[PDB]
Amino acid sequence: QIAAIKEAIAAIKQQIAAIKXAIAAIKQ
Amino acid sequence: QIAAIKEAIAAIKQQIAAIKXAIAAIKQ
Amino acid sequence: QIAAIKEAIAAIKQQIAAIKXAIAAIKQ
Ligand SMILES: [Cl-]
Ligand SMILES: [Cl-]
Ligand SMILES: [Cl-]
Ligand SMILES: [Cl-]
Ligand SMILES: [Cl-]
Ligand SMILES: [Cl-]
Ligand SMILES: [Cu+2]
Ligand SMILES: [Cu+2]
């Protein structure tokens, strides 16, 4: 359970990073 | 604690999916 | 492990809210 929670949170982080990259290009 | 963590991640994933739609709508 | 997970989710929630506001300002 704990390892799956770490696994899912890390995937959210890289999903957050792509969202911030998308917004930065939109505002360009 | 573990059950609340799982729910928070599940709620976060649904917010991520809606954010992606808002960004895709902006690109249209 | 439990502390890092809860402190990582709290940071992700702050990012989600800022992303939602950034997207809302884009739609303005
Ligand atoms: Cl387990
Ligand atoms: Cl584990
Ligand atoms: Cl507990
Ligand atoms: Cl529990
Ligand atoms: Cl620990
Ligand atoms: Cl802990
Ligand atoms: Cu489509
Ligand atoms: Cu409002």
Side-chain angles (χ1 to χ4, degrees), chain C:
Chain C
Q1 306 177 249
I2 304 301
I5 288 172
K6 289 146 79 168
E7 312 183 29
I9 289 168
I12 287 166
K13 289 179 178 176
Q14 295 295 304
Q15 288 178 314
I16 294 292
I19 287 172
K20 287 175 169 173
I23 293 177
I26 288 174
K27 291 179 178 180
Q28 291 281 256

